[PDB]
Amino acid sequence: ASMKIVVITEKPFAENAVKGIREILEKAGHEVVMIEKYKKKEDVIERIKDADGVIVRSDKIDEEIIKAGEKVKIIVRAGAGYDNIDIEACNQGKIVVMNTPGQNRNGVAELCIGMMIFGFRKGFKEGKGRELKDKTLGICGCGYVGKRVKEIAEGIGMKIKVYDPFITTENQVKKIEELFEECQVISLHLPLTKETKGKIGYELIKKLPYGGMICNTARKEIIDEEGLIRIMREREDLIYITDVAPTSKVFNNEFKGRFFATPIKIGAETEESNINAGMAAASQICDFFTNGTVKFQVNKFL
Amino acid sequence: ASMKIVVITEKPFAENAVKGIREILEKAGHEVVMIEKYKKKEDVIERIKDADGVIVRSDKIDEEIIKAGEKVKIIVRAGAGYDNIDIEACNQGKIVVMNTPGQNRNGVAELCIGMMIFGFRKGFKEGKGRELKDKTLGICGCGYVGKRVKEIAEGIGMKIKVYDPFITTENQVKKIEELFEECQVISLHLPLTKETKGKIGYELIKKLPYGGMICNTARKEIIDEEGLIRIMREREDLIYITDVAPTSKVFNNEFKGRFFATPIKIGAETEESNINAGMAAASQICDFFTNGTVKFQVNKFL
Numbered sequence: 312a313s314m315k316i317v318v319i320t321e322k323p324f325a326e327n328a329v330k331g332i333r334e335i336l337e338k339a340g341h342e343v344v345m346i347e348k349y350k351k352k353e354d355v356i357e358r359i360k361d362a363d364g365v366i367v368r369s370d371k372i373d374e375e376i377i378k379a380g381e382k383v384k385i386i387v388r389a390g391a392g393y394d395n396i397d398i399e400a401c402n403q404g405k406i407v408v409m410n411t412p413g414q415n416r417n418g419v420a421e422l423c424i425g426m427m428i429f430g431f432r433k434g435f436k437e438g439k440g441r442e443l444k445d446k447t448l449g450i451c452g453c454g455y456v457g458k459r460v461k462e463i464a465e466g467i468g469m470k471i472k473v474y475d476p477f478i479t480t481e482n483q484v485k486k487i488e489e490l491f492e493e494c495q496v497i498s499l500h501l502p503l504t505k506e507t508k509g510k511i512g513y514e515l516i517k518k519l520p521y522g523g524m525i526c527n528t529a530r531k532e533i534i535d536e537e538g539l540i541r542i543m544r545e546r547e548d549l550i551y552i553t554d555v556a557p558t559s560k561v562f563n564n565e566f567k568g569r570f571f572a573t574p575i576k577i578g579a580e581t582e583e584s585n586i587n588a589g590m591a592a593a594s595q596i597c598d599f600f601t602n603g604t605v606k607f608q609v610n611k612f613l
Numbered sequence: 614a615s616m617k618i619v620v621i622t623e624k625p626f627a628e629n630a631v632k633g634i635r636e637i638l639e640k641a642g643h644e645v646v647m648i649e650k651y652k653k654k655e656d657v658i659e660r661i662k663d664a665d666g667v668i669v670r671s672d673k674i675d676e677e678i679i680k681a682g683e684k685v686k687i688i689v690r691a692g693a694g695y696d697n698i699d700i701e702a703c704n705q706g707k708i709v710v711m712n713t714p715g716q717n718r719n720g721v722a723e724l725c726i727g728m729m730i731f732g733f734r735k736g737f738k739e740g741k742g743r744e745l746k747d748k749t750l751g752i753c754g755c756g757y758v759g760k761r762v763k764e765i766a767e768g769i770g771m772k773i774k775v776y777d778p779f780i781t782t783e784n785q786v787k788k789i790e791e792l793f794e795e796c797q798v799i800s801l802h803l804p805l806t807k808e809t810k811g812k813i814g815y816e817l818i819k820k821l822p823y824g825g826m827i828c829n830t831a832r833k834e835i836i837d838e839e840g841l842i843r844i845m846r847e848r849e850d851l852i853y854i855t856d857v858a859p860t861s862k863v864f865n866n867e868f869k870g871r872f873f874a875t876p877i878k879i880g881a882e883t884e885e886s887n888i889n890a891g892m893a894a895a896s897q898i899c900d901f902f903t904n905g906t907v908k909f910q911v912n913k914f915l
């Protein structure tokens with residue numbers, strides 16, 4: 312009846328999201344312990360050994376953590392992506408891994424739109440800016456976020472083209488090359504896999520029309536940083552804006568006036584998105600222990 | 614008859630807008646004289662002395678400039694507001710004064726939406742932001758810009774309430790007090806008149822809900838600066854974003870994290886808006902000297 316639920320967040324939820332988490336789980340007679348703003352993963356290893364269930368954000372969950380959590384039955388990522396979790400090692404420990412699809416979608420999409428206007432208007436500094444209206448937007452991967460970005464972009468009056476090798480939808484091109492050729496603005500929403508890693512590089516970015524802008528609210532490592540640096544040095548009209556800051560120091564030093572990155576990923580860092588993702592994670596934990604519910608599971612074992 | 618048209622723009626139009634102005638005016642057989650990037654309202658005086666028509670942006674057009682333009686028959690403001698022009702003295706000089714309604718509406722509206730997101734997301738810095746979706750937006754003055762903002766905000770999923778005595782629309786309040794009580798976000802789209810000068814002050818801004826935000830892409834003089842300073846010192850949750858930077862230095866010094874201003878007014882600083890505003894101004898001057906049409910005239914004399 313009573314399960315130990317550990318919440319691992321180096322980047323903590325807003326108070327109201329923690330309260331919601333506690334309200335769902337404690338009413339069902341569970342214990343909730345928080346691990347917030349931890350420095351070393353040694354802190355995590357200790358507090359997890361006794362945990363029955365886990366709630367996580369973007370926190371790296373690797374083999375060493377997974378094995379230390381010997382009685383862990385479920386890990387729920389409050390959000391969409393699960394590249395931070397070692398699925399293979401979770402399969403070994405017979406641990407159910409799930410996410411919370413679409414819960415952060417509006418936070419990320421609103422930031423994506425805001426970044427598009429910000430990038431097209433020279434970072435709100437002096438100079439001749441451009442308007443998003445009557446321009447073509449390319450959505451790279453169209454799931455929950457890409458869908459919302461599209462909705463707002465149509466209200467603004469942008470023409471929409473979509474690339475996604477896994478779905479069938481309107482205005483869809485089959486080649487990712489065509490998207491970069493046809494679209495004045497690219498928004499990336501691809502999850503990080505072995506296939507999408509370093510996929511967006513020099514050969515794709517170069518094909519952009521005049522004043523081409525890439526907005527990245529997805530993952531930094533789907534970009535080939537070397538290729539981006541190379542084309543941005545060659546073409547001084549290109550704009551790159553991102554919620555997932557690049558590692559290289561080049562971008563800040565060389566591309567002022569056409570490059571912006573947030574100091575940290577703030578796409579899901581809103582009061583509302585924290586509540587959605589935090590409470591959805593707690594409810595799925597609740598359902599799993601109550602009814603053996605494994606909806607939204609991403610892995611397979613035994 | 615070949616007329617001399619002078620274009621007075623301290624911050625110049627985009628080149629394509631200048632080209633579009635010349636295409637309309639030189640085909641009709643008129644002369645176009647550019648007065649770009651001057652420093653004081655004294656460079657204009659001698660060059661306007663033999664001007665027949667004038668195109669102007671936000672540039673200050675006082676009695677001294679009007680009296681010097683003794684053969685000026687028409688002044689067209691490429692844009693919306695005409696508080697920069699001394700109408701009284703124009704009436705005495707028997708000069709027709711026009712603006713170009715709605716031409717730069719999208720440049721401003723897009724910037725306004727971008728500023729709202731920017732402001733609700735801690736200027737794209739680290740912190741807990743808020744989402745515009747599901748919040749109520751108060752449009753203060755619902756003309757060309759106001760209406761276009763409404764349109765975009767509706768796609769974002771904001772609820773809309775309107776204060777504007779000159780129009781009839783749904784979800785409308787009759788007291789400006791009501792707008793500030795009921796709306797989390799306020800957006801100013803009022804012209805600067807006798808009535809609107811210093812209207813938005815302490816007593817109105819008081820009534821905003823928690824984390825109330827005001828976006829001002831209109832005019833700086835509609836704000837009672839000392840009143841705004843007072844309420845913002847009192848209420849640290851309040852946010853003020855503006856395209857029309859205030860006179861007082863207090864805002865930069867004290868309200869870090871909840872105050873954001875552009876270094877210069879950039880609402881109409883786009884390729885697209887320059888083209889629309891400039892070419893309409895040229896067509897309106899052309900029609901005035903061709904057929905004497907006075908549509909869009911904002912004054913009357915004799």
Ligand SMILES: NC(=O)c1ccc[n+]([C@@H]2O[C@H](COP(=O)([O-])OP(=O)(O)OC[C@H]3O[C@@H](n4cnc5c(N)ncnc54)[C@H](O)[C@@H]3O)[C@@H](O)[C@H]2O)c1
Pocket residue numbers: 692693694714715717718721753754755756757758759776777778779780801802803804805808809830831832856878879880881882
């Ligand atoms: N930042 C920029 O670059 C930029 C660009 C364009 C306009 N502006 C400013 O924003 C204003 C709006 O532009 P617009 O094209 O929508 O003008 P507009 O005339 O189309 O709309 C202004 C609206 O304000 C309403 N209004 C007038 N007096 C009012 C009062 N006393 N109280 C409440 N509402 C009142 C009018 O009914 C009108 O609908 C302009 O007047 C100008 O001052 C700024």
